[PDB]
DNA sequence: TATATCATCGATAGTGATATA
DNA sequence: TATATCACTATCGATGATATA
């Protein structure tokens, strides 16, 4: 049982392989010397020395300092009980570390903690140029729209989203649709013309406007203009979501819409 | 230090290594993320990003998003870091009481060896460290049979109160000399009781050079080293010798009429 | 042995923890054996030996005239001091490096940058520190107009770039948050404010930050999360329509403004 | 070449060995996408987007984000002198805080700072037994003592260290002797007793003192009593350095000291 | 014998390669 | 073609064994 003996210090009261053996021989012989303790344990002869100096820095025992130095062991029923008291203190101090480090975090985590959910990604700037590519990024944009939509259109937009557009009004989303005039003749409804009646929305044309352009909250669609490419649907376009920046846009936008409607 | 002073306390206090810290800043910060998302604004390498936010949710701090394309959350702050503590308080609690259990199978185990712990026939030890004073005090204190005399700093006989008092009840003639500083710790003491009952003399002193504990033909003192302080390491020595104690037991006459 | 002064000779000075350890203990007893400071600290005996040598060799630690391999702790005043100077030593040696580096690079891409004038009307810069490796390309490319305002960020650095635009005749316009004002005390900027080569005003705040060159725009987004972590989003835009949008902005702005 | 062009940005800037490929390989094509960064370059295929998205972070380049990202460098005139400018400050702040680490680690230092040099270790307490080590242990105190020496023997000292005691006191160490009455037959005529009529130490004997010792400045050496042992020179012996313990017994030696008779 | 040193393990952490629809 | 993951290196620090004179 001295193995269990040994077990148990190396488990529960910091001691290594070397340390336990040697306390346990302590305990069992009463006085050794780092020499004699070589002699009735498994502790290597050239480590008895700083093992035996170690149990004496851990309270494991006592010694007589000279040529030859002599080690008693602690009564064990005092190390152990007072090394459970000691231990109970260190965890004590762990414990007000841990918590005092928690209180500092949450304080500093504050002003970064997101509520909001990133719904398709944390970029806030998308360059879209396909057909295919700039109707499912118009499609999102409709889908993910809150509380208002305005819609300056003079043709840029490769699809018609009458269907997302009315949907998202059916959701209670705040709809404006601008149009140019030559877009109408090819507008028949189809809704939107009935959502517009039915005053479900608005909707105003305009002959002329130079930036067409889809807000949706706080995001921003647009073209950098480039007539030929628009032809070819492969003009190039930029999504940006940002309060400030689409809010600029929407200033541009209420220009457009208190000038025109049909 | 804001961002890296969190990930600092996350690795000195909640376990994290240094990816997974970044990391979970990084999921706080913005709410969710790809594996892809956060090597790209964080400083943890593209190839380790995978396994990292793995960790993170074995270790509870991040939530697997529903569906697909490797999307993380991070489990607010307050919930795991809450929660961290209270599983390391119930884990300290369970270590706890296996101490307490090893200690009562040791004793059990260590029972035969111990025919005589009778003590030897060594009349002087050396013990290191203050807070091991009483792991000798308390032998003294427990073969006293005709005399004790104790100047206490506050470390000869910290919480041998019992001890004491149990030699009193054995007829062994007590001294009590203290550090007015330490009579407060005596409030709810069954010393006072003793004192008052006049079962043992109780004086103090402002303070005194040489603190001590004499029992019989027995003393127990330490030395006094600032180095050897700062790491624990001071020198008290036990003598059993009635030259040297009488020297001692001089001393303490002396402290003993100027105290109280 | 404070554990801080350990803490800090790890974090500032290079020791690891055994080093830092051992050199505590030698200034705590002023010589230590290799054994005697395995007994004394907690550092492993096994250690002791390498640890105390690799002390000498960091300059923390001479060896004692001997021989019995004791050791001694060069001064901290000494050694601390000491170290600072060769490591501002040896970043004196790499920032010339560094130049020499640069100089060398810029010789041997020569050949390569051929490829260069900004088909793309759009780009990206990651974090407000790298605005200027965009909006310096702007200012040396501006031809007719120049609109600028800045909240410190936007063209950092950048006063002899404008002075060299306006010395083409681009015509300037400057606006600055009052903040940045002393910033200017003798810049070059004021010599030309006050000739009436540029016109530079001040406001108190404005909301988009941005510079206007020619028929390009540059601005940076919003984002609190993305600043921790130095990745805010910055954009590059060429198109007459989307510029004369932020051109009629800032003239709100600059309508505003203190003639500073 | 381009392994100089490379090696330099490792060396110096920060870069890894895909990272500086990559911004290599964008210096000399311009405007490229990840698969054909790939296609141009030593950077493995599956790497290339996470080393492109990362040059973007270190300004190394500029991007388009989108299902296919286009990347452009930033001119390395620009990012290159950024980048120096930049990592100059970042030394100033480390030189800062090395100095602010210094300040405190001499604060904290400065109590624990220790001027004396202990000559034969860090112990306080020894001991002894048997003439030999008794002997040593002896010699060594007198060697070191500087101040003061208080010699209290009946004997117990074992071996006649005379010469030790008068080489002590012709260092200039002031020295008290104290000797048993049944010892001074065997100190004439040498030589203790020559420098104590020179009145070069102060020389007194006494009858009876039941505790031995030997001081040396802040030090003690004593015996436990052990009349047998004493025969057979092997009674144990203590050594003590401490200024408040040697304290004690430098008051009981001089206690011993007004009792005893001169010469 | 009592001085003086080595060997093995696991976990970081930086860095260049490899694998799956 | 993009995603997903691995593999090697050196250092640390913890622990159990070996080497001189």
Request: hydrophobic content about 40%; overall charge negative; glycine content about 4%.
């Amino acid at each position: 049982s001295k193995d269990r003996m040994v077990e148990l210090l190396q488990e529960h009261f910091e001691l290594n392989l070397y340390e336990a053996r040697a306390y346990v021989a302590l305990v069992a012989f009463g006085v050794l010397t780092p020499a004699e303790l070589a002699s009735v344990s498994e502790v290597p002869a050239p480590r008895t020395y700083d093992v035996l100096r170690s149990l004496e820095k851990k309270g494991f025992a006592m010694t007589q300092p000279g040529k030859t130095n002599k080690y008693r062991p602690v009564h064990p029923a005092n190390v152990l009980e007072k090394f459970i008291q000691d231990w109970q203190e260190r965890v004590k101090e762990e414990l007000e570390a841990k918590k005092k480090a928690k209180e500092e975090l949450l304080e500093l985590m504050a002003p970064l903690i997101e509520t909001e959910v990133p719904k398709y990604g944390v970029e806030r700037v998308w360059v879209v140029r396909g057909i295919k590519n700039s109707t499912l990024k118009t499609k999102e944009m409709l889908e993910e729209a809150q509380n208002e939509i305005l819609l300056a259109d003079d043709g840029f937009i490769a699809v018609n989203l009458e269907d997302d557009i009315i949907k998202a009004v059916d959701r209670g989303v705040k709809t404006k649709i601008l149009l140019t005039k030559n877009l109408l003749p090819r507008l028949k409804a189809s809704k939107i013309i009935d959502y517009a009646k039915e005053g479900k929305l608005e909707l105003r044309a305009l002959d002329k406007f130079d930036l067409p352009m889809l807000i949706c909250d706080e995001e921003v669609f647009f073209a950098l203009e480039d007539l030929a490419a628009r032809y070819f649907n492969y003009e190039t376009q930029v999504w940006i979501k940002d309060h400030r920046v689409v809010a600029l846009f929407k200033e541009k936008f209420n220009e457009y819409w208190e000038k025109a409607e049909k």
